[PDB]
Amino acid sequence: WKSSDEVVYLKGLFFPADREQISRDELYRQYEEAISLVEMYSSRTRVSHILQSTAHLFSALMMLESFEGGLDDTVRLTASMTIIRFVNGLLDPNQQSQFAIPLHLLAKKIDLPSLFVEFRHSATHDALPSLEMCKTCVDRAIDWVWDHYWDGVLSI
Amino acid sequence: SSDEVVYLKGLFFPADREQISRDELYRQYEEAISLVEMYSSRTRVSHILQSTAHLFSALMMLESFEGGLDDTVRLTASMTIIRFVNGLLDPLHLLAKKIDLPSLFVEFRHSATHDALPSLEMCKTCVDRAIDWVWDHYWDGVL
């Protein structure tokens, strides 16, 4: 997958080389285009989960960066759902299995920071994570998909 | 029973709901949600109060959707339903029957959690039905 012209094109929308230069309108329009495109590639493959996670992470990022004040609940609910689904699509296959292992060991295994496991537990069972906890965890998850997927996307 | 809960019931579920504007209705919802947020900071607040606040937050976002990408309203609504169900329930289907929680909520929680994100229409149906449920089983008996 990491070589296809389709994912290489998506990488340039989600992670423009251009980025500091580009206007935020243009930036968001490129993000939005990539999100629409992802709906097009929908497999039960690890890559598909990364693409869909990336789409919703940037959906949450724009909502977080656009927050102008007032009630913060909808943006925290949006970001929290995104993080849960991101973690779950990476961890569910083992955790939902007949031979599940402790999530901390399972996260250590795919190099997923424990903060994401803790975030998921809070958003699932406890107080909804705060605005800044959501912003930090959406930022770090974008870092993660980049480190573990997008960085390696290139034409051969 | 408490004055605060009696006041909140009139903001979430006003009498004049038939004859009131979206703006007026939504300003009262936001007042109620900010009040809950305020109670929750200081003191212990019930799950039904917290979920009612987020449910109306999700409802407003759903009704205000006007086109374009629907992902954020669906993510918002899905997280609200998951927490609503989790606070009530944590064999889920069996537990839900015991408390008269429709099975559709367990199925929604599962999809949002583990599979495809539910559709805009599934989100609206669920939020509507969850607001009906907290009325039937909590708010209706406050007076």
Residue numbers in the entry:
A (entry chain A): 10 to 165
B (entry chain B): 12 to 101, 111 to 163
From the paper:
A HEPN (higher eukaryote and prokaryote nucleotide binding) nuclease Las1 and a polynucleotide kinase Grc3 assemble into a tetramerase responsible for rRNA maturation. Las1 and Grc3 are highly conserved proteins and have recently been identified as core enzymes involved in processing and removing ITS2 spacer, which is a key step in the synthesis of 60S ribosomal subunit. Recent studies have demonstrated that Las1 is an endoribonuclease that contains a HEPN (higher eukaryote and prokaryote nucleotide binding) domain responsible for rRNA processing. Grc3 is a polynucleotide kinase responsible not only for Las1 nuclease activation, but also for nonspecific phosphorylation of the 5′-OH of the 26S pre-rRNA produced by Las1 cleavage, providing a signal for further processing by Rat1-Rai1 exonuclease.
After screening a large number of crystallization conditions, we successfully obtained well-ordered crystals of the CjLas1 HEPN domain and determined its structure at 1.80 Å resolution using molecular replacement method. The crystallographic asymmetric unit contained three Las1 HEPN molecules (HEPN1, HEPN2, and HEPN3), each of which assumes an all α-helical fold. Analysis of crystal packing and interactions across HEPN-HEPN interfaces suggests that the biological unit of Las1 HEPN domain may contain a homodimer and a monomer. HEPN1 and HEPN2 molecules form a face-to-face dimer related through the preudo-twofold axis, similar to the HEPN dimer in the Las1-Grc3 tetramer structure. Secondly, the catalytic residues in HEPN1 and HEPN2 domains are close to each other to form a compact active center, whereas the catalytic residues in HEPN3 and its symmetry-related molecule remain far apart, presenting two separate catalytic sites. We compared the HEPN domain dimer structures in CjLas1 and CjLas1-Grc3 complex by superposition and observed that significant conformational changes occur in HEPN domains upon Grc3 binding. Remarkably, large conformational changes are observed in the catalytic pocket. In the Grc3-free Las1 structure, the catalytic residues Arg129, His130, and His134 within one HEPN domain are far from the catalytic residues in the other HEPN domain, while in the Grc3-bound structure, the catalytic residues within two HEPN domains are close to each other. These observations indicate that the Grc3 binding not only stabilizes the Las1 HEPN dimer, but also promotes the formation of a more compact catalytic pocket, showing better catalytic activity for specific cleavage of ITS2.
